[PDB]
Structures are given as structure tokens and as C-alpha cells.
């Protein structure tokens, strides 16, 4: 029956036990076998039933006056009980396993519909929901967005993950925030028509041509990470950008960014950058990511005195001293570089995460007073000493120093060699071109703990 | 392949996009296409991936060193990727849609397994998990618990929802906390063997005989609500009870509770209680529920001066004044009684929820200084006046008074009658045995708002 005709136990109406328990509370009852009438059911206008392990919403069709529901983070598959709930204005049902959204098709009073991370492919049922202003369909398996073409009140939209053809967006000029992350898009030409866009998230697509963005001057947040960008000249137009993510592309020429002085967050990791001089004027930056590039000279960063978070890992940097002037720096990552001298880092007392593994660091004494550290990385240093002559009996000084200034004794020594402060000594009865040793010393500075370890190579001439 | 043989993109290993995104963060990467090695995967020992909209855990089989996982509140169905993760000690996977737990069968290092609110019927796969000390299977569709019989290290157990036969519990004498709520149990005789039980939750079963509990003197928490209890004499043995729920039964004789002086929470709603004198000595009570009984004389509650929460709704109480001495009372519910005089409630200034609809209340002035109220209910009062003689022209005084002391004018008047302060007047040209009027006045006291409304009936002699 489409109505409750006699006072009926809650657990006969709501057959999912988790929903029945929720409804007991909502309906002001004390046991799921308590009876309710249609009138009692009609009092319910909102339902926040997220995270409850609900697998079925059978029974919800009797809650005729629902206007807002949240069933996010459940196990919903079948949503047919919503079909006739036409007073619904907002639905939150992200993080379920819904595939068939035909039951939404006549819910034309919907203004908000959140369905991200379900199993939806066919969005044709959304075609007539023309009052929508928020529609979230990211992390689904949609390939065809034709059904969106009439949704001309949309302000916020996302969808995924199989879309190639964006042409159905052409008339959606109200759009302000668009998230097309994780699709199969190369052609973003339609986006030039969406001149009200303030946020465009397009991570992990196949985009190489960003000229469509040139007239999108309202953009303040742009994520194009994980694409195929190289020429970013278009971005020079986008002077309202404050949050720009360009990581995992093929970019080398940063000159188009030089005038983007509102930027506060700039992500440029995993590109082909060797020259950051165009960044020198971006003095509002608080977060800058430059990992996995080809950097050696980082002197331009010294200008960026609002930085609190900086990544430089996986470069070819030997001179880290430009960061020494960044007083607000809280987290600094430069593992996998060629830094030997960390004397300049003694300045940085606001530092709480200092990650410097896989460098050429031999002496921790400059770090000794960095007592606000809570996370620390110093594993797997390596350096090669200047050569000395092969001799049958060769000695070199141990140079490895802990934070206290004490020498750290070798952990292993090659070629049968041995320690006694201060040298490492080898007897080499055969001709030999190299010897080496390692060290491995746990250390804590402030509250941050790591192993300071490394391999020292000594060429023999 | 059962191993990762070459550095492999995270999103090729973890095919569920939500899990891949989580794993990107766990593995210290910045894009789901970043590559990882088997060694990187082997660093992961714990995973907290609840509430993420994960539908598949494909890929988790490569995380060989996992010992603790939380995948609660997702959409998991198939858990075969766990089969060979034999270093697992704790799994939290409540609130999914798992049915087949065969993949757990060789995870013999498990000490904790939480699976409540899934779709599990067959628990035979748990048979050899003899190191379990916590096993949560409530809100499933289990009928046969034979597989539990060997799980002799269990301390905490729950299961549901089709169990009738509890005999497999007989040897589980380590059990301290058992939750058999929402099954089909009538025979709890086996429970007499579980003499270490401190908590027994058995809500919504078919229990009428609780004599098995007589030797379970370690019980401090007992929930038998929603059963078929009448004789509760056995409970007199259980002197360590502090939290006792007996709502929705057939109980009338409370004498067995009189010596349970550690009780702090006692729920007795929806029984056949008319005499609460046996409760008078339970002075540690902070919460007492007596709704839906046959109470008239509540004088014994006056002894219960630690009460903060009291329900009395759906009784036959006319004298509410015994509650006036309960200074700590925060929430008081007595809707659907026969209370006319609330003068005594002026004492209760700690009151924050006062629910008194469907009484005989005509004058709110005693409530006027209850300014800590935040929730208030005064709807649908009704009373019948003492009769007056039929006359062709009949008048009676309006007695309905708001918190301010002002008379509240009638909203409707029967039989064509009319108001002018102070009487309601009728012209009755035919013989008439009754007239009536209603009132309906929104009111706020402190921060609590309600409609003070009612129907006043005047018999004519
Ligand atoms: Ca309750
Ligand atoms: Ca990041
Ligand atoms: Cl250059
Ligand atoms: Cl009696
Ligand atoms: Mg951002
Ligand atoms: Mg309790």
C-alpha cells in the first residue's frame, strides 16, 4: 500500500534494522516495535541518517513530507523508495553503491543532489531536474553527460570517471565550480563558454591545450595536475588565481606565472623545471611545491617570506641556504638532493618537519637547537670524498658528527677495514680503487626522531 | 600475480579509486599514478580507511605486513583480498554489506573482529579463529552459532538476528560481555554457565524465564527490554546491577528490585506497574523511566534525590508534586497524565526539558521563573469542569492563564457560543448536556517554546 492505514510497528515499515532504530529515535519512540500512524510519519521533514550501515531505505516512501535527506556513507543500492518523495529539495547520498538513479527522475524540486562515489553510469534520469544548483557525481562511472545539457541553474558540478566529451556543458553558463577530475578529457574547449567559473578542478585527465581558459578570468582556483601540459602561456591571463596546482605535467617555462601575484598556493611538483626566477615576485605564497624537478639554483625562493610549507625533494640542489630566510617555514622537505651543508638551517626555529634523507649531510650540529621539530628525516646520506692515493695501508678520518658534536662510529666498513677514532683504516694487499664505510645512528631533535645513516665512499688513486 | 614485481602505479594495484587515493597518502605519494614497489607496500602495518566510499579492497593483498585494519562504513561486499593477510590481529569492518566471510578463515592471529551490521549468515568460517577475544556480529542474519563453540578466548561477543539456539555458547566461560539483542531467543538456560558475565544485552527477544540468570552475580549491566518478562524474582540475586533495562515487558511486581541499591539507571517503561514503593530505596538512581504504566501514586520517587532524568508519560498521575524535591532533575516528561496543578514544579530550577502535554493544566504561572528551560511541551490539555445547570443562557468563567497571569482567550467555542472576558457565554434554545471551548496560545519559558492548548468541557445538568 502507498499509505499507512493503521497504527503499525516501526520495524514493519522500515525493514532495514538500522533504519528502524534511527526512525525509532526520530519518531520519539522507545522501541522499534512501537507503533506509529501516518500522521506521525508525516511530521518528519529532514533525516540525517549517514554512517548507520543502512542497506535499504524501504519505508521512507511513507515519510511524505521529507525535504532534506542525508544517507551518505551507507550501503544503498536500490533507491526506489524515493520515487514519489517530490517535496525533496536536497539529497546527500555520496558514498553508497547506487547504480540506478531512475527513482530521482521526477524529483524536480531538487536544488541539491550529492551522489559522488557511487556506481552510477546512466545519468539520463537527471535530465529534467532543472532546478538543480549543486550536482555532485564525481567518482562514478559516467561516460555520457548529455543529460546535463538542460541543467541551466547549476552552480556547482562534478562528474566522473569516463567522460571524454564535454560539449553538453555549453549552455551551463551559471557554472561557478566545476570538477572534472579523473575523466578521459583532452578537449576542454567548451570551458571557454563558462565565463563565470571560479574553480576548475581537472586533475588526472589528458589535457595538453589550455588555451580555452584564456577568457576565464574569474578563476581563482585551478587544478590541472596529472595532465600533459607544457605550454602554460594562457595562465598569464588568469590574474585572480590564488590556488594553482600544476603538478605532474611537462612544464619547464614558468614565465607565465610571474604576474600571478595573488597566488598563495602553487604546486609544481613532477615537471621539468630548472629555473624558478619567475616565481620570485609571488610573495603571497604560503605553500610551494617544487619536488621532482631539475632544480639546482633555488636562490629565487628567498623572496618568498610568507612560506610555511615547501617541498624541494628529488632535485639536484646543493645549496639549500636560500631557505634560511623563510622564518615562517614549518615544514621543509628536501630529501634526494645533493646538500652537504645544513649550517643555514640553524636559523629556522619554526620548523616542525625537516625531511632531508638521501642528501650528503655529515654533520648535524647546525640542527641542534631546532627544538620545535616534531618530525625528522635523515636516512641514507651518501657522499664521495675527494680521492687519496692507493696505499697498502690507507687511513681516513671519520667526519660524521651527531647533533652533540660527537663523532659517530662506523657501522660497517668495506674491504676488511677497521675503526679506531678517528680514522678508518684499511690494509689493501691488492690494488684497489675504492673503499667505503657506513654509519647508522638514531637521533632525536626536539621531538622528531630519525636514523641518521649514510654511506661514505673513498676513491683511491 | 601474488606479488608486485616491478614498480607499479598505485591506481593499477588499488583499482577502487577511493582506496587508491587513500593509499597515495599512506604511501607518501602525491598522485595515484605514482609508482610503488613491493618494499614500499610492505611498510604498511595499519590502515584506517573507514567512511571513504570504498567498494573493493582489491590490492590490499599486497600489503603483506598489515596487522590492523579499519574498513568500517564502506560498501564492501567481497573481502577475498584478505585471505592471505595472516599477520592481521584486528579487523574493524562493521557497516558494510559483506555476506561471505570465508576469506577470514585462516586469519588465526585475529584477536579482534568487528563485523556488525553486514549481511552475514554463515559463520562457519570463524570456527578456527580461536584467539579471538572480541567478536561482533550483531545486526547480521545469522541463525546458527555452532561455529562459535570453540572460541574459548572470547570476552566480548554479539550476534544476530535469527538465532534461537544458544547451546554453542556453553563452553565460552571467559565471556564477560554478551549482546544477543534482536534474535529469536526464548531459552537462555545456557547463560547460567557464563558466570563471568558482567554485561548481558538481550533486547527484543522472546524471553520469559530469567531463572538462568540467578547465579550470574557479576552482572552489572542487564538489558531485557522487549521480551515477555513478568516474574523478575531472580533479579534480587543480582546485587551488582547498576544499569537495568526492563522496558516493554509484562512486569508488575517490583519487589525483587528493592535491594538493588547500586542501580543508577533503571528503565521500566511499558510494563504493568502500579506500585513503585519498592523503588524508594534506590537512592543512587540518576535515570528512571516509568512511562506507559498504570501509575497514580508516585510519592515513593521523592526519595530519589539524585535523579536527573525522569519519565512518567502515559500514566494516570494526578499528583505530580513528589517530583518537586528532585533538585537535580534536568529532564522531566509526564505528558498523557491527569495533572492539573503544577504549582510544585516552581521548585525545579534545573529543569531544561519539561514535557507536559495531554494533562489537565490550566494555569502556567507556576512555571514562570523556570528560565533554564530549553525544551517545553504543553500541547492538548483537556479537562472537564464540574457540571452547572442547563439554562437557555449559560455563562462560565474562562480559567485559562498564561505564564504572565493573563487570561488566554478561547480559540473556538462550541454551540455558537461567544467570549467577552471573562466568561464564555452560550444561548442554548434546545436542551443541551454539554458545551465546550478550546484555547491555543504559543508560549516560551526561558528558551523553550510550545503551544499551550487545550479543550475545556462543561457538562450541563
Ligand atoms: Ca531509551
Ligand atoms: Ca599534495
Ligand atoms: Cl633557463
Ligand atoms: Cl500493589
Ligand atoms: Mg586547494
Ligand atoms: Mg546503559
UniProtKB/Swiss-Prot annotation, chains A, B:
Instruction: Tell me the outcome of changing residue 353 to A.
Output: No longer binds human CDH1 domain 1
Please report which protein family the annotation says this sequence is part of. Answer: Belongs to the internalin family.
> What is the protein name given in its UniProt record?
Internalin A
Q: What happens when the gene is disrupted?
A: Deletion of both inlA and inlB prevents bacterial uptake by human enterocyte-like cell line Caco-2. Deletion of inlA alone decreases host cell entry; the reduction varies from 98% to none depending on the cell line tested.
The entry's localization annotation reads: Secreted, Cell wall; Secreted
Annotated effect of mutating residue 335 to S: 170-fold increased affinity for human CDH1 domain 1. 6700-fold increased affinity for CDH1, better adhesion to human Caco cells, 1000-fold more virulent in mice
Q: Which GO terms describe its cellular component?
A: extracellular region; peptidoglycan-based cell wall
- Activity modulation: Bacterial uptake is inhibited by EDTA and by anti-E-cadherin antibodies.
Which lineage? Bacteria, Bacillati, Bacillota, Bacilli, Bacillales
Domain LRRNT: where?
2-42
Q: Where are the LRR repeats?
A: 43-64, 65-86, 87-108, 109-130, 131-152, 153-173, 174-195, 196-217, 218-239, 240-261, 262-283, 284-305, 306-327, 328-349, 350-371
Summarizing the annotation, the consequence of altering residue 309 to A is:
No longer binds human CDH1 domain 1
What does the UniProt entry list as the effect of changing residue 158 to N? 40-fold increased affinity for human CDH1 domain 1. 6700-fold increased affinity for CDH1, better adhesion to human Caco cells, 1000-fold more virulent in mice
Question: What is the membrane topology here?
Answer: Peptidoglycan-anchor
Mutating residue 382 to E has which effect? In strain: F4233 / Serotype 1/2b, F6789 /Serotype 1/2b and F5782 / Serotype 4b
Task: Share the domain note from the entry.
Answer: Consists of an N-terminal cap, a leucine-rich repeat domain (LRR), and an Ig-like interrepeat domain.
Keyword set includes Hydrolase: no
Effect on the protein upon substituting residue 153 to N: In strain: EGD-SmR / Serovar 1/2a, F4233 /Serotype 1/2b, F6789 / Serotype 1/2b and H4
Swiss-Prot/TrEMBL keywords: Cell wall, Leucine-rich repeat, Peptidoglycan-anchor, Repeat, Secreted, Signal, Virulence
